[PDB]
Amino acid sequence: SMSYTWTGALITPCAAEESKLPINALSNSLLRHHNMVYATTSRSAGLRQKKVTFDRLQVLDDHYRDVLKEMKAKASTVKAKLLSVEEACKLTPPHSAKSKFGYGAKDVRNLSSKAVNHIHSVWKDLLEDTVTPIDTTIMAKNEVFCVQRKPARLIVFPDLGVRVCEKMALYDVVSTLPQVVMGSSYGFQYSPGQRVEFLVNTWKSKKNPMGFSYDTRCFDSTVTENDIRVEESIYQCCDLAPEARQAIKSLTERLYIGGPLTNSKGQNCGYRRCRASGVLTTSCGNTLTCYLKASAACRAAKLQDCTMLVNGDDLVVICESAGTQEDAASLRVFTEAMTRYSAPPGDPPQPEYDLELITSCSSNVSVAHDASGKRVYYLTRDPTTPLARAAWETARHTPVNSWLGNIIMYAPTLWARMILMTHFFSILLAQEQLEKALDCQIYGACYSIEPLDLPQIIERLHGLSAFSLHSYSPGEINRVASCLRKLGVPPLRVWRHRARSVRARLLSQGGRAATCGKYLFNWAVKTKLKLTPIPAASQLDLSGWFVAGYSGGDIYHS
Numbered sequence: 001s002m003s004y005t006w007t008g009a010l011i012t013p014c015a016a017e018e019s020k021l022p023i024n025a026l027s028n029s030l031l032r033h034h035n036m037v038y039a040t041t042s043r044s045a046g047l048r049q050k051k052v053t054f055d056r057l058q059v060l061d062d063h064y065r066d067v068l069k070e071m072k073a074k075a076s077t078v079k080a081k082l083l084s085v086e087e088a089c090k091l092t093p094p095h096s097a098k099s100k101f102g103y104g105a106k107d108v109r110n111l112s113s114k115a116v117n118h119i120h121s122v123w124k125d126l127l128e129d130t131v132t133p134i135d136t137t138i139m140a141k142n143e144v145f146c147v148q149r150k151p152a153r154l155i156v157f158p159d160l161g162v163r164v165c166e167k168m169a170l171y172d173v174v175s176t177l178p179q180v181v182m183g184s185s186y187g188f189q190y191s192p193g194q195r196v197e198f199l200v201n202t203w204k205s206k207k208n209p210m211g212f213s214y215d216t217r218c219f220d221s222t223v224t225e226n227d228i229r230v231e232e233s234i235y236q237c238c239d240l241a242p243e244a245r246q247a248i249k250s251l252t253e254r255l256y257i258g259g260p261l262t263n264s265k266g267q268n269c270g271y272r273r274c275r276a277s278g279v280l281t282t283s284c285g286n287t288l289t290c291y292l293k294a295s296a297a298c299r300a301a302k303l304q305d306c307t308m309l310v311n312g313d314d315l316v317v318i319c320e321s322a323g324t325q326e327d328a329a330s331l332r333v334f335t336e337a338m339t340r341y342s343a344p345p346g347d348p349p350q351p352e353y354d355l356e357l358i359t360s361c362s363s364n365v366s367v368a369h370d371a372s373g374k375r376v377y378y379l380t381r382d383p384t385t386p387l388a389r390a391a392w393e394t395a396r397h398t399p400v401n402s403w404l405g406n407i408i409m410y411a412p413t414l415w416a417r418m419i420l421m422t423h424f425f426s427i428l429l430a431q432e433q434l435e436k437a438l439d440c441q442i443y444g445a446c447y448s449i450e451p452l453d454l455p456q457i458i459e460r461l462h463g464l465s466a467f468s469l470h471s472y473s474p475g476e477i478n479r480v481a482s483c484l485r486k487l488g489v490p491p492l493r494v495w496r497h498r499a500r501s502v503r504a505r506l507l508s509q510g511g512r513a514a515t516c517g518k519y520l521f522n523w524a525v526k527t528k529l530k531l532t533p534i535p536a537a538s539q540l541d542l543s544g545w546f547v548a549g550y551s552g553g554d555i556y557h558s
């Protein structure tokens with residue numbers, strides 16, 4: 001079973017692609033080493049195809065089936081509802097790819113008769129046909145990174161009408177099933193703070209903690225037909241409407257298991273027999289499968305009290321240590337098991353004895369001190385990619401504003417506060433666009449957010465301490481310092497000066513802007529302000545923010 005079979009037709013761009021960092025009058029204020037930043041384009045799609053194309057083999061033992069049986073028992077307690085066409089339509093991103101059948105995301109959100117009519121015919125076809133492969137478009141993603149250059153990732157997705165149908169049949173399932181089956185181990189239920197909390201408590205629950213992150217190589221490509229049918233067997237355990245069962249069975253046989261791949265020009269590029277990266281079940285399916293294989297592998301390797309944290313293909317394990325030597329051996333067996341399950345490693349896993357040294361979801365726990373001098377744990381990450389992307393967003397408006405999402409998710413960090421907040425608020429002020437709502441993604445779901453609500457959002461998600469953290473760790477400070485030199489970012493003295501200016505301007509604006517100045521930049525003044533809770537905060541309806549993962553799921557919220 002080859003993950004893909006190719007015809008030779010190229011994966012074509014659907015419009016002009018820029019690979020070099022665009023420079024405008026603001027670029028240099030952020031970073032000077034422009035040649036360090038690049039965007040991937042279809043030009044490197046061939047290289048990716050080569051990496052993701054391989055044969056998969058699977059040897060499934062009793063630990064695998066024992067864990068599966070447990071997962072199904074939990075899945076059987078779940079009751080999921082079939083979404084209505086209109087409900088499904090409302091979950092569609094305003095700029096989601098237009099259908100090939102005469103309508104776009106806008107027509108869908110408006111419940112246009114044409115869109116609704118087509119969606120209804122697609123649904124009917126799903127119920128009547130459970131064998132015909134469904135077409136998919138394959139595109140090379142345009143993503144920004146800082147040099148070592150990686151090839152573009154491949155996104156595979158069905159037509160907009162099919163996507164609306166996926167939500168109707170499975171939105172409720174993928175939104176609720178994961179937490180029930182995996183409990184505390186399901187990562188997408190946590191906000192950054194709760195993640196840290198879970199990690200710290202788990203780490204503290206062991207007598208001699210040891211943990212590791214396990215990077216599966218090209219996870220989507222390792223997912224086999226068996227894996228995808230086992231995922232369906234789990235979904236089918238739920239209490240479901242008869243029409244939902246049929247739709248899920250049909251989507252599994254016709255789309256999830258595999259299908260023909262068409263490029264932007266309409267040519268047949270080949271065939272997929274692995275996970276599609278752009279379907280509704282990509283995150284839920286990967287999480288269930290990663291959790292299933294890892295849980296079984298933990299038993300096979302005889303890991304003592306293995307606790308796991310899984311987010312899609314991202315996996316981190318914290319267990320009871322048995323000595324550095326015994327640990328190396330177990331992890332080696334754990335890896336051998338995952339490999340037999342068709343989840344071979346990219347970077348071999350290594351045991352860690354310092355929670356701060358474990359990277360999962362590209363992040364790690366670190367510690368700082370609040371205004372009281374108390375140690376506080378928070379989530380941070382290497383700022384390289386976030387800064388490379390902010391550089392790009394400094395000269396170009398993009399669909400997803402990573403700078404805003406990073407400020408939200410990494411609000412307590414030294415780098416998000418010193419740089420992203422200062423840099424972008426400065427630009428927003430200058431352009432008088434403080435109150436303009438911008439789109440960003442959180443766990444794959446798209447949200448429309450007004451920058452002026454940041455203080456409230458940050459307090460809600462991270463607590464007041466996010467505005468007073470200081471005395472960061474030596475390791476964290478060193479990483480930030482190294483990153484700034486690499487990219488050529490101005491030093492602290494420059495950002496503090498800019499922040500004071502930005503703050504002063506915001507305070508003068510009054511209202512929310514004043515609050516932004518007050519809380520977001522209190523770190524810049526020598527005589528710190530009081531800083532206390534905020535009224536409007538409780539108004540924000542943050543329900544749904546950290547419930548489930550939807551990467552590639554074409555999901556949008558207010």
Ligand SMILES: Cc1ccccc1S(=O)(=O)Nc1cc(-c2ccc(C#N)cc2)sc1C(=O)O
Nearest residue numbers: 414417418469470471472477480481484492523
């Ligand atoms: C607390 C805070 C938050 C955001 C920006 C600046 C500050 S601060 O200057 O007050 N204090 C602090 C500034 C730090 C810093 C260290 C290295 C580099 C580089 N290259 C930039 C800034 S570390 C720190 C600390 O408190 O541990």
